[PDB]
Design an enzyme around this catalytic site. Structure first.
Site, PDB file in Angstrom:
ATOM      1  N   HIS B 102     -12.426 -35.071 -24.779  1.00 47.33           N
ATOM      2  CA  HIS B 102     -11.888 -36.288 -23.627  1.00 47.33           C
ATOM      3  C   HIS B 102     -12.886 -35.899 -22.441  1.00 47.33           C
ATOM      4  O   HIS B 102     -12.816 -34.810 -21.910  1.00 47.33           O
ATOM      5  CB  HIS B 102     -10.434 -35.997 -23.429  1.00 47.33           C
ATOM      6  CG  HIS B 102      -9.943 -36.809 -22.051  1.00 47.33           C
ATOM      7  ND1 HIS B 102      -9.845 -38.220 -22.204  1.00 47.33           N
ATOM      8  CD2 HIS B 102      -9.438 -36.572 -21.000  1.00 47.33           C
ATOM      9  CE1 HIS B 102      -9.427 -38.592 -21.008  1.00 47.33           C
ATOM     10  NE2 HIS B 102      -9.079 -37.628 -20.274  1.00 47.33           N
ATOM     11  N   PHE B 113     -11.191 -44.258 -18.465  1.00 43.95           N
ATOM     12  CA  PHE B 113     -12.173 -43.819 -17.600  1.00 43.95           C
ATOM     13  C   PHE B 113     -12.064 -42.984 -16.413  1.00 43.95           C
ATOM     14  O   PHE B 113     -12.060 -43.181 -15.114  1.00 43.95           O
ATOM     15  CB  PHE B 113     -12.708 -45.459 -16.960  1.00 43.95           C
ATOM     16  CG  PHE B 113     -13.096 -46.333 -17.666  1.00 43.95           C
ATOM     17  CD1 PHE B 113     -13.490 -46.055 -19.215  1.00 43.95           C
ATOM     18  CD2 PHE B 113     -12.739 -47.740 -17.575  1.00 43.95           C
ATOM     19  CE1 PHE B 113     -13.813 -47.217 -19.880  1.00 43.95           C
ATOM     20  CE2 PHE B 113     -13.169 -48.623 -18.291  1.00 43.95           C
ATOM     21  CZ  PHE B 113     -13.540 -48.485 -19.755  1.00 43.95           C
ATOM     22  N   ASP B 137      -4.136 -37.654 -24.709  1.00 42.44           N
ATOM     23  CA  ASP B 137      -4.879 -36.879 -23.674  1.00 42.44           C
ATOM     24  C   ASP B 137      -3.935 -35.733 -23.311  1.00 42.44           C
ATOM     25  O   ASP B 137      -3.871 -35.446 -22.207  1.00 42.44           O
ATOM     26  CB  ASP B 137      -5.558 -37.509 -22.603  1.00 42.44           C
ATOM     27  CG  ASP B 137      -6.486 -38.499 -23.315  1.00 42.44           C
ATOM     28  OD1 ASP B 137      -6.856 -38.553 -24.545  1.00 42.44           O
ATOM     29  OD2 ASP B 137      -6.963 -39.619 -22.510  1.00 42.44           O
TER      30      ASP B 137
END
Ligand SMILES: Cc1cn([C@H]2C[C@H](O)[C@@H](COP(=O)(O)OP(=O)(O)O[C@H]3O[C@H](C)[C@@H](N)[C@H](O)[C@H]3O)O2)c(=O)[nH]c1=O
Ligand SMILES: Cc1cn([C@H]2C[C@H](O)[C@@H](COP(=O)(O)OP(=O)(O)O[C@H]3O[C@H](C)[C@@H](N)[C@H](O)[C@H]3O)O2)c(=O)[nH]c1=O
Ligand SMILES: Nc1nc(=O)c2nc(CNc3ccc(C(=O)N[C@@H](CCC(=O)O)C(=O)O)cc3)cnc2[nH]1
Ligand SMILES: Nc1nc(=O)c2nc(CNc3ccc(C(=O)N[C@@H](CCC(=O)O)C(=O)O)cc3)cnc2[nH]1
Ligand code: NA
Lengths: 246, 251
Positions: B102, B113, B137
């Protein structure tokens, strides 16, 4: 060539444009000779050497006397030198100004016009003692859009200078015009006002619109204009682009 | 009754040519470590522009296909997500060791982003290599490294610095990841997740918004990434003006 015209120019696009105009208008200018010079103060005039231009010093007493003695007309096409009173008072001097007099007289008019919304365009005027001040002979406004940078407006002004020269160069040489005065007071911007704008105040409070207008005003292809100082004295230069998409 | 002084299959799912190409090379250079490991490479089905990945000989896989999930669970000992555009279903992550690479510093600005959000909200950014759970994540951090953000950075500037750090972590830890030479203690810091719609919202400028020149510059530099059409304002006739900003340190 009974009539001698001096073109004093520090701007390759305009010099190139005028030389072509005179070439394709040889019948209109059969009794006129054009000499081309760049100004003493020019710090990179090499590009103009390529077109047969050499330095002249408009504040040299020697060159002023020679110009006054030899030439019937001086045209300033973005001449970086202020003409002394002894030149403008003793020979007919005409300036091609990339602003709409009397608005944003002086330095980089389109930068100030993007910010202050006053008109911009090209003014061809008689040259008096003061800067961008004499009688208007021909002028043409160019519009400004919200997606323009300085470069976009400047290219548009330059295309209007060329349009006015195409229509009026012979009029200017043969004095086929009427001197005009503005009813408006107008305003002047000097090189020190432009340096002022360049120094960004990151703490300044305002609308995103005002800040975008400031940065697009100071954005001009590869020029390093808008900056702030880092603690250590290093500079951060800011540039902005704006692109219209239908 | 005698010891003579079996093949591990690793699946790399990736939608990022720079990472894939870099990992392929990294495997060659560590080939003395990977005698008994074979790496297969696939890109995501939802990938809208796969050309440059198909040129590396990658084929598509669909992590939301019952059939593809069964094949992965059947065939692979390890799956590595390297900037994978697809969310792994609970049936993949719960049944196979899955590891994500990541381009953020978990748990700060999880999701889309991360460096865009970091430039604005001043949370840290970097690279996180983590176990994949059912959330995004979110699984246990294996390795991570923060990268600095400067005043004069755009999204592109920070992203490239993150990409270098991602490459540094893989050089140091690809073998480690494969052979579970790592520690995987849970954090109870949830952090914050940004979705694609949060990015799209930031992109719609309000020209009437009052703030400091700093805060406006920070927003436009965050939304500036090469030729991407990010920040815009809407014109009355529905058209858009796209805004990009550059910032250049000159000593
Ligand atoms: C040198 C410089 C230029 N520029 C941009 C703004 C300018 O309008 C444009 C063209 O620059 P330039 O130096 O060729 O300037 P010119 O177009 O030749 O015109 C300027 O000087 C003449 C002597 C005067 N008669 C004009 O009123 C003055 O604005 O480029 C910048 O954005 N930054 C710069 O530092
Ligand atoms: C598509 C797009 C990208 N970007 C910039 C910001 C991004 O961090 C950078 C790279 O984006 P990327 O999608 O092209 O390449 P990646 O960083 O590899 O992103 C990939 O893995 C991520 C975990 C997923 N969130 C992405 O959907 C997937 O494409 O480009 C923009 O500024 N605007 C954009 O519309
Ligand atoms: N006397 C005079 N009047 C003008 O209108 C005129 N116009 C241009 C304007 N050019 C310039 C050049 C440099 C600087 C400067 O401030 N340095 C200002 C104006 C050429 N010289 C002129 N000189
Ligand atoms: N289950 C799962 N956990 C993760 O941590 C994970 N990491 C990446 C993050 N990738 C993405 C890709 C798209 C979107 C999205 O469409 N919204 C979110 C995360 C790959 N898949 C994962 N899938
Ligand atoms: Na930068």
């Amino acid at each position: 060539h009974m009539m001698h015209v001096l073109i004093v120019s520090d701007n390759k696009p305009l010099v190139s444009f005028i030389q072509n105009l005179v070439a394709v208008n040889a019948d209109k200018f059969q009794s006129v000779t054009f000499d081309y010079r760049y100004s003493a103060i020019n710090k990179n005039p090499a590009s103009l050497i390529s077109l047969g231009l050499t330095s002249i010093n408009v504040k040299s007493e020697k060159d002023v006397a020679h110009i006054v003695e030899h030439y019937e007309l001086v045209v300033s096409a973005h001449c970086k030198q202020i003409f002394p009173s002894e030149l403008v008072n003793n020979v007919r001097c005409i300036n091609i100004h990339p602003g709409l007099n009397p608005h944003n007289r002086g330095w980089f008019p389109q930068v100030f016009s993007i910010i202050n919304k006053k008109p911009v365009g090209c003014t061809i005027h008689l040259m008096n003692e003061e800067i961008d001040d004499g009688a208007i002979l021909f002028q043409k406004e160019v519009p400004i859009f919200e997606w323009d940078t300085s470069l976009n407006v400047y290219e548009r002004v330059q295309q209007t200078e060329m349009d006015l020269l195409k229509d009026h160069l012979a009029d200017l040489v043969f004095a086929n015009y009427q001197q005009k005065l503005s009813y408006e007071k107008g305003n002047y911007n000097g090189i020190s006002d432009f340096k002022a704008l360049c120094k960004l105040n990151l703490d300044h409070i305002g609308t995103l619109r005002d800040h975008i207008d400031l940065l697009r005003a100071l954005s001009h292809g590869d020029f390093n204009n808008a900056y702030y100082l880092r603690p250590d004295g290093s500079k951060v230069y800011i540039r902005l682009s704006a692109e219209l998409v239908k």
